[PDB]
């Protein structure tokens, strides 16, 4: 279920799901580096009915994973609200900015 674009935590993912790329929801595939910065989504948990902050950290420094591409946009906003915006490469400040895949890290309520 975590490998589907419909999975609730993925509500603002624009990119490849890391869990399809040899990583998990919260870990980079071997040899790709987490971004320290990220866009953030607010996603609805269908089980408890509460909204949670999800941090969409990229994994960087390897070329495109190419698997499980998602382009979901719940509560996503343009670049004038920059940390809510997902049409930019959140690897942009890494030592190597090549985009590999995206994670969906649960922050909290």
């Amino acid at each position: 279920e975590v490998n589907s674009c419909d999975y609730w935590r993925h509500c603002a993912v624009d990119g490849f799901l890391c869990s399809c790329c040899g990583g998990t929801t919260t870990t980079c595939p071997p040899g790709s580096t987490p971004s320290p910065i990220s866009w953030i989504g607010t996603c609805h948990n269908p089980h408890d009915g509460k909204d949670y902050l999800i941090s969409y950290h990229d994994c960087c420094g390897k070329t495109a994973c190419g698997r499980c591409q998602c382009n979901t946009q719940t509560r996503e906003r343009p670049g004038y609200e920059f940390f809510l915006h997902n049409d930019v490469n959140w690897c942009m400040a890494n030592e190597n900015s090549t985009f590999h895949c995206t994670t969906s890290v649960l922050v909290g309520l």
Partner: protein, 361 residues
């Protein structure tokens, strides 16, 4: 007998040419510009743009500007962000202009990579992730300096009635205007009143750009206006794109480079889809609506062909639309657009198409 030769120019004249910016997202390090003839769908050539290239054509029609990122060993080693100058007719590299290593990496909205009206400066979006606007001096082949005043703002809207002025959309819901001096540094600036509520009615960044004003559409199908005929920008809106029927079926705008303006007539073109709700602002077009910006009424609606981005040519009265892979050519010399042809497979993953400039002085 026969001999293979290089050194040739593009086979069709400039006035026939369009530029399809292929991100090739599946292999984003090999992005490129595909050059096509819009009159017959013929592939004319290409310009390689490495990782997540952006592209524009010089106002004078002689050069193609690209913007890209290299690293010494692609996925490791030292970063070089650059603007490149290419000859439009030979499709050859001429010059590299070094940028600071923070040029925007993202999808190809027009406003991330622009030039002043007089063609003397390239004006680009930076993100480190702190935002500023970068100025490149074309004559000098130099980077000038960051426009730090634009922190917390996004994208570049040139003012076509002034030689080196542009605006940007800010997180306060207003517009910041920057007026450059002859050296590309900020000579003066001004900030408008709030144009839109960021929380309650966020706008798409793509302008419908007239010579002395600009229109923007919102997530909920409203229209906002920025009039820069004066030194102070006067902001207005909203007015609704939607009648009662439209509202009942929840029609909203959706797309990327999703609007355009035919300046002579004041017709604004907008990609629209039904059953709008939170999360549908980048949905493909069910329809294209054509709005009279003077009467504030819709004058036409046609099938969207799942289009996501468009561009307008004032000089030949044309509209191109783009669904990610295929380019549609429309005649917009009358209120209802007419489909002339479709170019299939123009790109693998493009969200931006542009004409080769004709005239425009």
């Amino acid at each position: 007998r026969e001999v293979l030769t290089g050194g040739h120019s593009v086979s069709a004249p400039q006035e026939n040419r369009i530029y399809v910016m292929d991100s090739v997202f599946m292999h984003l390090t090999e992005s490129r510009v595909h050059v096509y003839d819009y009159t017959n769908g013929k592939f004319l050539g290409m310009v390689p743009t490495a990782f997540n290239g952006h592209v524009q054509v010089s106002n004078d029609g002689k050069k193609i500007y690209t913007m890209t990122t290299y690293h010494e060993r692609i996925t490791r080693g030292k970063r070089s962000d650059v603007v490149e100058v290419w000859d439009a007719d030979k499709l050859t590299f001429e010059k590299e202009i070094s940028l600071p290593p923070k040029r925007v990496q993202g999808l190809n909205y027009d406003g991330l990579f622009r030039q002043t009206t007089d063609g003397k400066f390239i004006v680009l979006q930076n993100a480190s992730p702190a935002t500023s606007i970068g100025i490149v001096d074309v004559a000098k082949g130099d980077y000038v300096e960051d426009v730090t005043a634009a922190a917390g703002c996004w994208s570049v809207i040139p003012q076509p009635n002034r030689p080196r002025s542009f605006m940007t959309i800010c997180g306060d819901g207003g517009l910041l205007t920057i007026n450059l001096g002859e050296d590309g540094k900020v000579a003066s600036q001004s900030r408008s009143k709030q144009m839109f509520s960021v929380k309650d009615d966020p706008i798409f960044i793509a302008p419908a750009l007239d010579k002395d004003k600009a229109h923007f559409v919102s997530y909920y199908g409203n229209v906002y206006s920025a009039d820069f005929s004066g030194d102070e920008v006067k902001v207005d809106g909203p007015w609704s794109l939607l009648n009662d029927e439209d509202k009942a079926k929840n029609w909203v705008p959706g797309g990327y480079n999703l609007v355009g303006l035919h300046r002579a007539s004041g017709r604004m073109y907008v990609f629209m889809h039904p059953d709008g709700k939170e999360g549908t602002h980048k949905f493909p077009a069910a329809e294209i609506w054509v709005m009279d910006t003077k009467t504030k009424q819709r004058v036409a609606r046609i099938p969207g062909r799942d289009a996501l981005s468009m561009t307008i040519d004032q000089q030949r009265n044309l509209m191109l639309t783009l669904d990610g892979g295929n380019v549609n050519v429309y005649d917009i010399s009358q209120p209802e657009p007419k489909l002339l042809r479709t170019i299939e497979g123009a790109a693998e993953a493009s969200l931006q198409v542009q004409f080769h400039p004709v005239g425009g002085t």
